[PDB]
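Q: what sequence does this backbone want?
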């Protein structure tokens, strides 16, 4: 896909059913919620987290916290299925020592989108981003270090895993408005699992 980035198409296909079962378990403790940006806007994507740290929004500035600001309780621990799939994907991508301490779970309803951004809330740039697609297909935008750099448009389907790091760790990326559709395992949405090393 780019220097230090690759797309493992259908890599998580066999694990998908189990991953989704665990998403449901995580959501039981920390429900999906549409976060409000530091700017005061409700995101179309619904999110939740598991692992030691969870990505969240604050009155002013994104940040990681071990506490779910909605439930006021710790985020659920990282499911075994998540941990194992993530490490296998990272190894295949060329990052064998990846040890994530956070997993952001995104749920896209039809029309939902995640505008172009950089994952720049993690201090240790040596750790890659492992992104798992589940359910409905979406168009993933992958660019460069500048918001105006040319964008690649790649369809991401159920089971696809994208890993980026090294030279492309801070590349801009996003998801275009989700097209309506149906998928036997997620029904009416697309889920995405984003593993990161947010601390240390
Ligand atoms: O849904 C995706 O494929 C991308 C999600 C993403 O960029 C994020 O969680 O920071
Ligand atoms: Mn991102």
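A:
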């Amino acid at each position: 896909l780019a220097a230090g980035a690759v797309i493992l198409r259908r890599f998580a296909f066999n694990a998908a059913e189990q991953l989704i079962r665990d998403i449901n378990d995580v959501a039981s403790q920390s429900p999906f919620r549409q976060m409000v940006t530091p700017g005061g806007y409700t995101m179309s994507v619904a999110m939740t987290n598991c692992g030691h740290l969870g990505w969240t929004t604050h009155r002013q500035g994104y940040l990681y916290s071990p506490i779910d600001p909605q439930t006021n309780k710790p985020w659920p621990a990282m499911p075994q299925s998540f941990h194992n799939l993530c490490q296998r994907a990272a190894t295949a991508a060329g990052y064998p020592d990846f040890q994530p301490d956070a997993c952001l779970i995104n749920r896209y309803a039809p029309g939902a989108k995640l505008s172009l951004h950089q994952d720049k809330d993690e201090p240790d740039l040596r750790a890659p981003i492992v992104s798992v697609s589940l359910g409905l297909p979406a168009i993933f935008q992958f660019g460069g270090l500048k918001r105006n750099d040319p964008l690649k448009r790649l369809l991401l389907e159920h089971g696809d895993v994208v890993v980026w790091g090294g030279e492309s760790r801070l590349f801009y990326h996003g998801i275009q408005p989700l097209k309506a559709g149906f998928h036997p395992l997620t029904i009416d949405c697309r889920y995405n699992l984003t593993f990161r090393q947010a601390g240390k």
